[PDB]
Structures are given as structure tokens and as C-alpha cells.
């Protein structure tokens, strides 16, 4: 909402004459009480010869691209200059605005006599943009006949000492979408007397002798008031006075004819939208009714709307007159030849208009005010104000007929219910002791009825404030008018917190631990790539494909939510690689979305009570599973090139080591077992178990997934379900034996298919407590041990808890361990050593 | 061509098994280390009190006798001030020593900051006990001090019980039994109910506590008629021993890698 | 000679900002709560006092889960986590909720559709706007310097009443200390308490 | 805390250093007689009569623990410590008693502080044997001086500062 300071000032001045304030101050008072000033535009300044001219002669210049006009312009004192202009929106006899040589326009433009298109041009004719008066539309500014004689000082006629405040009103404050509302706000801020510009002293009631038009209203439509008055015999060629075309222009509304302009004006003055129907184009009774399935209307702009059974309409016997509250229709639109006007002054249902306007994408000036509730008490006053003004400009007469449907049965008092609040409740909530009676005076200033009753106020808010419904609403009023800056800064006593939880600590430690080892965290997108699972070659019944789908993504091809974090990780890996950062290791810690059924939503639960424990569990069960995952990808080098040697390319072993890092950070023990699972390589893919629960996978990616996905050769990956890794809080108590140790190295031959950790476990099982440490050294294959066998050399460190281990004692433990590997994985002793 | 790509498939798929690998091989080429367990105990204690609005203060280990004793209301010929119980800096009567508790850090803190003051001081302290399985001459201690208007023993127990719950479980409580410390008055000893184990939930002596002595407040310019205070101190090696079941303190201080690694990284 | 054969990585900067914010509020006695990102409309809107036809509840401003009218969405702020927290715990409740939220803004240099937000909620006896400013100013000092303050200017949020916007005084730089819009705040709306 | 996490992750095991130096450690190191590290605050009643000096450097205690691990068969070790040292600026000057019925002046504090030795926080570390262990990947990498420079870079990264290394004797 834009409006200009002069008008805002005029309306405040009625009740506090001589009121006036710098724009800077006004901007600050508006912010201080709740209104966002997006922008302050003082009307761009002019200097020198910028005067009204009259076009006296137009010569269409031929031979060029555009149609060009060499115009004789009467500039005062019988002085006629020729001027070149490209526009076409003006005729001989029109008052235009000319910047003559020596003038300076907004933006630092000096005008000079310039030869152009074959003739001399002594300046130019201005657009309202070039003057910084209004928005740039096509062509120049033309003034209504009689606004000014030629020669008149442009700056004075245009009123360029004005300033246009551009405000972003909040939806609770619809009443401020008008000069009426803001005026009242300013009067409240500055403790000024306020004359309501919709009061009867300012709009005397017009007579009421009979109904102005037949009207049926289906009341379940939500209409709360519907008033009509006609004006007959208006000059259709009359145009609106300069003052009125101007304030529309400053407010953002282009003028068209008095019928339309007067409604737009009174809409801005009082906040009550209005509309003008060509009465002679109405066939029969006016009907308010819902639309039917498949019904259609063409609105003013001649565009066909597909209607919805919740859109309220105005119809007649012939067709549709208005999508109520949003936009009139063509069928009754005022046109060039309209002599007799019927003026609509209605109050629609806020939620109805909101629904309808969002569906049709018609955020009209009318719609946005009805969304935020219009003061129903002023419809006839706005209708009367708007009728007199029309007759006054375009010279018709205002019939004393009047229709005024106010519901069934009629509402005669539009005041909300009274709200009941303790006199000092504002003081509590602010933490400030306001001077006595503050709270009552401020609630009176906004227009409420305040009655006292000991320590308990009874407050009936006024009809234009439907947002004032509980004491919290009343508090914000008092607090914003006194200023929020007067509220002190008092730290509250907060209780002994428990600090972070175990899982919160575990995510931090997983992050430190991976980051130190060279991984760079990304923020994964939850929106999957298109067809990623077709790229991975996942079977159609692969659980990962069962995705919760978003219904309005910012990319129509990417509407599924991630059931796995590798897609987003792999996407970031691709980005780093395409920018030359080929040696990368990324990781992420975020939830996935795995749904358990088809999207079942639970219906509304009353908000006046808290939901039951059961209603919570049902709400929780309605949502998909959303476990925390950790995941990571690696590509290129893992150790970089240097003086130490050429570096080490990423290998699947590095993804297993990522598992062990997360497990060490989580203080749990994991086992890795071979597995086939896409998108991993089948011969290099491990499944991760904590105890006997699967927590995820790790390994090198499938070479065919790599290839279809444009991924780097050899990329490795890892994903673990954190929710599947249990809490652990060890209280270790390590037995630290000081007695000497015996070191022996044993080599075992086993079938190639046997995992190294199996042989290690068997050796540990057989050797018992004496074995302090076991570690795999060598892994050797060759013909002489058998084409399908392999030789594992383990390094064993034995140590007794109470004695110096003999070296027979050790070989006892060795022999015992060798026997265990024989019985469990069929090991054969190769040999041993020290 | 019905079966040109069906064996062209199983050709490619047994290439993938030809490049199989023993996923159970060790992968850790940068063995994990370990922050020391006492430091992690100190870490977890610190965070417990930070989470309650407290702050940590530090100070020198070699410390003026002014701040170790006199400001803490030890008489001029108190037994602890002899070469039996306290490490002294040469030469004789140089009023310099290795601090025997972290309380001086709290005096320093009470001198430097505006009241109210809720301060933890966790650091290395020094007594002359011979190193055996239940004593160390170089030990780490955690001491608190809270000075404010209207503080009472009930607040002392409140903080004690909160502290206990974080270090031992929601099943843990404290009891206080009168004792004597020059720093405090009244003074009690704090036993803790360690339910989670010990082989069978029993009370254990944890530390001492008490209301801060008026004389400590004068020695720091604080009016005892306006502010009161409480304090407590628990020894960390003591706490690690008895919670974890570590029969031999020597393991905590001898720096054997085998003692520390099983506790994990501490990251 | 270079010695780093295991190049250092990095935790993401937003997570470390979240880390430093979290610790700031932990140090004041608060606790952190978490919750689902896909969240019932019950807890995103209705419990937070959004009317049944509020503009934010259209496919313009909020990600919705198929199919149409399944009362499921990507949460547009972390407040539901605080509702869940107020349902589950005994009062008083001093809770921070720091997590990933989702609005439909196109990704340009000053907007992201997937953003991370930090929300607080303190419910107790006798709380007032002055306590709101106290916490705000403490928060600001830890994230910006001891020279940092907040000012509050009335605004509107359905969740709160009164409602203000919080500008912060970022003295340490910006090329010259100026006020900056930081976030919003307010007293929690009675209706959120009944719900 | 971050220096401790960062070193521990890279394979270092924290010890609790003793502040009581070994006997004649500096004669072992061959430090010149005027080497500032020799100027030690001395304890007047140690539990070991030959070990009465306080550490002006943390390497002695670190090296002592390294010896212990090596003598127990743990030859591939990397230890670190984070603790203050005690470096005195004069001969042991003690300040006399200040009345306890009043709080000391700001000046009496600064004099008390100036009477105590300098006690800066140090971080320190030792390494020996292997730095990468033996495995299927290859024979391992013995500790080399480059690994001690990399310890510097780890602490510097943790401290969010930039360091330069210059040759020195």
C-alpha cells in the first residue's frame, strides 16, 4: 500500500489542525508502532522551466519507425514552441506537461534544444515517470481539462512537494489499508483528537425512500452487508478532477472514468472496496449465490475464470456480475457510454475471498482488503460518500432509493464481543509499570469502549478491529503505542539444565571425528534427483523406491524425498569434481524419510484442549519413519601427492575405515560381513552389524552405477542408520599388566573364502586371556599352498597378569589358538616365529 | 539374440566376483589415540555445571600461601601447613607452595568478579601422600563455590544432587554428615548413592562440602550479613576409581597406553 | 616441507554456527529438542494458531506432502518441536529447537528453500517481554561481541502476541556498525497454551 | 579441548605429566649451564630426594612415560600432554602476610602475582617406533621428524592460527 503524505496529513489535520511532521519523523513513528515502511519516495524534484502546456497542433512525422509527433505547444504568454514526442496518448487541445530548455528533471537530466528526426525540439513532453510523479506506463501525462492554464508552474500543479509512503501492512491490520486507518494510527501515536472521515458529520446520510434494486442473498455465502444506491444521468465523457486523478496515481491506481475512479478513491479513503455497475446492463434481480460445479464467469479484464463451488457470485437473470469480493464481471462493467450507475457496497466473508483469490490468482485491491476483514459498519457511509462524489464530478443525480441487506435477521450492532482484562495486565506482560490510566486511555484511543470495575476492565473493541479478541490482543495495543523501547532487558532465572543428550553428543563427535580424518560435511538436499534409482538399477520393489512425494517442488522432476542420503552426497561429489576438485571425501548427518504405508493424514483435533496421549501416538504413526542417518562418499585420492610419494587413490577399504571411525566415535563395536546390495559393488560391499542388527553398508560403488551416473571411477560410499546404533556408556576398567610380554608370529593357511576376521576370532578364542593383542600382518597367495587357499600371518602378543610368562607357557597358548582355528575354519599351521 | 546378452550378463557378473575382496581386513592405518580418562571425567563434570549456569576458573598450581591458607581460614599454625601434608617451595619461609586444593582459584575469582559468583575450579592439586593403589601425590580435584543472596545448605544439597545425577544416573542421591573443614562452617562429608553398580548399590564417600566461612568472605571484601555461600570438592581420581572399579590408581598416572585406549578418543 | 598426509576436513559452517548457538543456550540452563521435518499439520499450524485458511497454508509458501489434503507437510519452522516438547515435559520449559526447515523460496544469493533455523520457547510463571529482551541480549552478546544489543519493533506473527521484529547491533564489523534485521519474537499466544 | 580431540584422533595418547623433573635430566640433554630451562623452582620436601625441581618443560615427563611404554613392549607410541610449566623469574621471593580482616588491594594482588613464577600452559608430544603400523597394506612407516612437524600443524589447525617453521639449533 502506497499513499501520499498530503492526504494522510489532510485527514489528521481535521481534528488537530496545523499538524505536520518531517518524512523522516513519520517513517520513524510508523515503524515504532508496527507498520513496515518499505520505502519513502519524495516526489522527484524539478527545476526551471517545467510548465503546463496545451497541445495546439500535431504533425504526424512519416518515414521513421515509430509514429512521431512534432507538436506546437502553447506554453503561456502566447508563446508557442515546437516539441518532438514519441507517445500517442494525447490529442490536440490536451493539457500536457513540458520540460523546456534549461530545465532539469529527476535523475539529473538537463533539457536542451535538440534537433531530432528532422525538426528542432524545444524540450519534450513528460511522462509521470520522467517527472517522478507516478509509475511509468506507456505515453505522457495528460491533465484533465481545466486543471491549469498553459504556462502554469508544473511543480505547483503537480504538487511535487508531496511524499509517498510505501507501507507493507500486516494481515492483522486490514483497517490500516486506507487513509482512514493510518490517520487513526497517527492520531493515536501523537495523542491527537481524531475526526473519523466516515462519521456522519463528514458524510451526511443520503435519503432512504425505497429499495434501490431487487436482491436475493443466500446467507450461507458469508455476506454480512450488501448495499446498493444508484446515480442516474451522469455525463459519460466527464473525466475526474486533477486532484482525484492525482491521489489515485500516487496510490498506484490508474484513473479511467469517474464511475471507476470514485470507487477506487473511496476505497483508499475508507478501506471499504466499492464497485460500479452499469445499471442499464443489469437484467432483473441481483443474486448472491455460490457457484456450481463447472460454472464460468468473464471478469472485467475479459478473461474467462473457471469457478469453484466455494466462490460466492453476484448474478442476474442474464449472467454473472461479480465474483464477489474479488473482481466485477464484464456483463455489468461500466463502459464509455454508461449513463446510469448502480454502486455495490458489500462485505464478503474473509476466508471466502482469500480462498477464491488465491485459486484464481486475482489479488485485487478489493480482495486484499476483504481478506483482512472490512469494517461492516461503514458500508452505507462509503456508498453515500461515493455516490455524492460521483454526481458531483460527472453531473448526474443521486436517487434516494437504497438497498441495504444486513443479514437475516438484520444486524444492527457490528461491535465484537467485549473482552475482559485486568487493568494492569499490560504492565505485567511488558515488565513495565505504565503511568496510571495508560492502558485505559490507549484502548480508548483505538476506539474501544472501556468501562472500569475495580481492578478489571471491560473493553468493547470497535467494528473495524476484528483482530482484538482476547487480552493478549489488548496488550499489544497498549505496548506498541507506549513504545517497545521502554521495556527493560532482564535475564530470567533459568533452571538447572541437563545440557546435551547422549545422541546430541554423538552427532557432534561423529562430526569432529570424520572431519579430522579429512571429510567435508555438506548440507544434503532432501529432494532426490530424477530417476536416481533407475540409474542405480534398484529392483522395482526396492524399499528405497517407496518415497514420500512432495506435491509442489521447485523442480517438477525432483519431487521425491530422500530415503537415502547417498543421492545428495553423490550430487555434491559431482559438483566438486566438475570444478576441478577431484580428490574429495564428503559426509552428511541428516534424517531420511521412509514411509510405512500410503500417505495417510490424520484429521483436525480441537485446539481448545490439548490432544490425548493417543491422538499424539496416532499423529506420530501417521508420519513416515524419519531416522537419523550418517553417510559419506570418497573419490580420487585419499592421501595426496607429495614428496613422500605419489599418493593413494581412494579404495573400498577407505569406506570401511569410515565405518570404523563412526563406530569408534559412537563407542560401539562393529562387524563387517560380505553382502550384495546396490548401489554397491557386489564383491566389495560390506554390511555393518552392531551385535546382530544391520546398521547399514559400506564399500566401493558398482562400476555400472558409477558409469550411468557420471561419477568418478572407483567412488566409494557408506551409509549407516544412526537410530539403529544403540546408546553406549562404557565404564572401562582396563587390566594393565606390567609383566613382560612374549611376541610370536604364526602363519595359518585357510580357504580363500574364509574372512580374515574369522581366523583372528578363532585364534583369540583358542588362546585365552594370555593373548593381549592380535594383528594381521601379511596375506599371501601362491601355487604351493593351493590355488584356492591363502596364508594369513598374524602377530600375537601374550602377557600374563601375575607372572613373567615362560616361553613354553606362550607356545601352549599358541598351540591352543592354532587348534581352535583348525576346528572352526579348518586352518592349517604354516609355521611360527618370534 | 534372445540369449546374446543373457550370458553377456553372467560374463560381466563373474568379472565382478573375480575382483571380490575380503571386507573383514583391517583398515585402520592411523590408529586412534585417547584423551586421558581423568581429563574426560573433568570434561563431563565441567559440562554438567556449565549446563546449570556455572563458569570455570583456572589459576596457578604454584600459589601464594596468602591464597592457599590464610584467605581460606587456616590458622597460622595449622597442621596442614607443615612439611608433612603440603609441598613447599624452597627456601624455608618463602610463603610459596604447591596448592593442596583448588580453592585459592575461587578466592582469586571472588576478588576479580562481581557478585553473584557461581564458579567451578577443576585442576591439578598436590598433597604428600605416597603413590599406592588408592592414593596419588599429584591428583585432580573439582571444587565448587557459590556466593549469592539467600543461599542455604538446601541449595548446597540441590547442587550436590544434580551433580550426582549427571555423573552416576537418575537413581543417584547424596547424603551429608557433619564434619570439619577450616574453609566451611557448617561442614559436612558428602556420600553418594551409586546405584548403577559397585556389585550392589551402596553408599560411598565422595567428598566434602559446607557453607563458606564468614572469614573467607571478609578476606575478599564481601559482607557476610548480605551474602552467604556454599562450597564442595570431590577428588577426580577418587571418583574414577570407585565408579569404574579401577583397583589401582598407579594405572591412572603411569601413562600406560593400555590404560587409556579402551576409554576411546574423547572426541 | 609439507607434512600433512591426512588433509584436514571441515564440519559445515552452518552446523558450527548451530553448535555455537546451542552451547550459548545450554550455558544459560536451556535444553535442545529435536523432531521430524515431515510433520503433521496439527503441530505446524493449528497448534501454533494459524487460522484454517491462513495464506501460509497454501501451495505458495509451504511444501505439502501428496496427496492433496493429507495434512502432512515439510515443516516451515521448528516451532512444532516446541509444541511436542510442551506436550511431553513438565513445566517450566526452556527449550531451543535448531533444525532444518523448508519454505518455497527460489535459491538465489539471499534465499534458500532448505534453511536451518534456531527457535526458542520459554514458558514459566511470571515471564514478561523484559525476560524476552534479556535472553535476546544475552544471545546477541555471545554470537557477536560484548558490544552487541537488540532492539524490538512491533510486528505480527500468529504464534506470538505481542509480536516484534528483532534487530541486532553488530558492532564488530559490517564495514561500520549498523543495525540489522535478525529475527522475530514475541510472547507466546494464549491459544498455543490451551492447545 | 579441541587440541586434545585433534591430537587424540591423530593417534596420540594423553598422559598426566609429573611436575617433578627426573634427576639431572638437563645434564643428560647436555644443556649449557646458563640454559634458562635449568633455572628451576625447587621443592623443599619431595617424595624423592633426587627429584626436587619443578618442570620448566614437559618433555621430561613425556619422555618418562614413553620409556615406560617401551619397556613394557609397547614400542609404537605417540604421547602428548597439556599442562602448565613453572619458569621462575628471580630467586624464590615470598610476600609476607596480608591481613585477612580486609580484602587485599589491587596492588597487593599484583605483588602476590609477581612473586610467583611464570606458569604458562604448554602442549607437548613425543613419538617413537612406528607411526603407521604394519598390516596387509605394507610394512608400516617408522616415526620421522616430519611427524613431529605434523603434530605442530595439528595443534595449529586446532588453534585456528597459521604457523611457519624455520630451521634452528
UniProtKB/Swiss-Prot annotation, chain A:
SMART domains: B3_4, B5, FDX-ACB
Catalytic activity: tRNA(Phe) + L-phenylalanine + ATP = L-phenylalanyl-tRNA(Phe) + AMP + diphosphate + H(+)
One GO cellular component term noted in the UniProt record for this chain: phenylalanine-tRNA ligase complex
List of residues binding Mg(2+): 467, 473, 476-477
EC number annotated for this UniProt entry: 6.1.1.20
CDD domains (UniProt xref): PheRS_beta_core, tRNA_bind_bactPheRS
Domain tRNA-binding: 44-155
Pfam families xrefs: B3_4, B5, FDX-ACB, tRNA_bind, tRNA_synthFbeta
Note on cofactor: Binds 2 magnesium ions per tetramer.
Domain B5: 414-489
A GO molecular function held by the record: phenylalanine-tRNA ligase activity
Cofactor(s), by name: Mg(2+)
Record note on quaternary structure: Tetramer of two alpha and two beta subunits.
Entry similarity comment: Belongs to the phenylalanyl-tRNA synthetase beta subunit family. Type 1 subfamily.
Protein name: Phenylalanine--tRNA ligase beta subunit
Source species: Mycobacterium tuberculosis (strain ATCC 25618 / H37Rv)
Name of the encoding gene: pheT
UniProtKB/Swiss-Prot annotation, chain B:
This protein's encoding gene: pheS
GO MF annotations, alphabetized: ATP binding; magnesium ion binding; phenylalanine-tRNA ligase activity; tRNA binding
Binding-site residues for Mg(2+), renumbered to this chain: 185
Residue window of the full protein shown: 75 to 341 of 341
Cofactor binding annotation: Binds 2 magnesium ions per tetramer.
Primary localization class, coarse: cytoplasm
Requisite cofactors: Mg(2+)
Organism per entry: Mycobacterium tuberculosis (strain ATCC 25618 / H37Rv)
SUBUNIT field: Tetramer of two alpha and two beta subunits.
One GO BP annotation of this record: phenylalanyl-tRNA aminoacylation
Upper lineage: Bacteria, Bacillati, Actinomycetota, Actinomycetes, Mycobacteriales
Name of protein: Phenylalanine--tRNA ligase alpha subunit
Keyword Hydrolase: no
Domain of life: Bacteria
Swiss-Prot record, chain C:
Record carries keyword Lyase: no
Organism encoding this protein: Mycobacterium tuberculosis (strain ATCC 25618 / H37Rv)
Family to which the UniProt record says this protein belongs: Belongs to the class-II aminoacyl-tRNA synthetase family. Phe-tRNA synthetase alpha subunit type 1 subfamily.
Reaction(s) catalysed (UniProt annotation): tRNA(Phe) + L-phenylalanine + ATP = L-phenylalanyl-tRNA(Phe) + AMP + diphosphate + H(+)
Shown chain mapped onto the complete sequence: 99 to 293 of 341
Gene Ontology BP term (one): phenylalanyl-tRNA aminoacylation
GO annotations of cellular component type: cytoplasm; plasma membrane
Keyword terms: Aminoacyl-tRNA synthetase, ATP-binding, Cytoplasm, Ligase, Magnesium, Metal-binding, Nucleotide-binding, Protein biosynthesis
Assembly notes: Tetramer of two alpha and two beta subunits.
Predominant place of localization: cytoplasm
MF terms (GO), sorted A to Z: ATP binding; magnesium ion binding; phenylalanine-tRNA ligase activity; tRNA binding
Free-text comment on the cofactor: Binds 2 magnesium ions per tetramer.
Protein name stated in the entry: Phenylalanine--tRNA ligase alpha subunit
Cofactor(s), names only, from the UniProt record: Mg(2+)
Localization: Cytoplasm
Binding residues annotated for Mg(2+), in chain numbering: 161
EC code(s) of this entry: 6.1.1.20
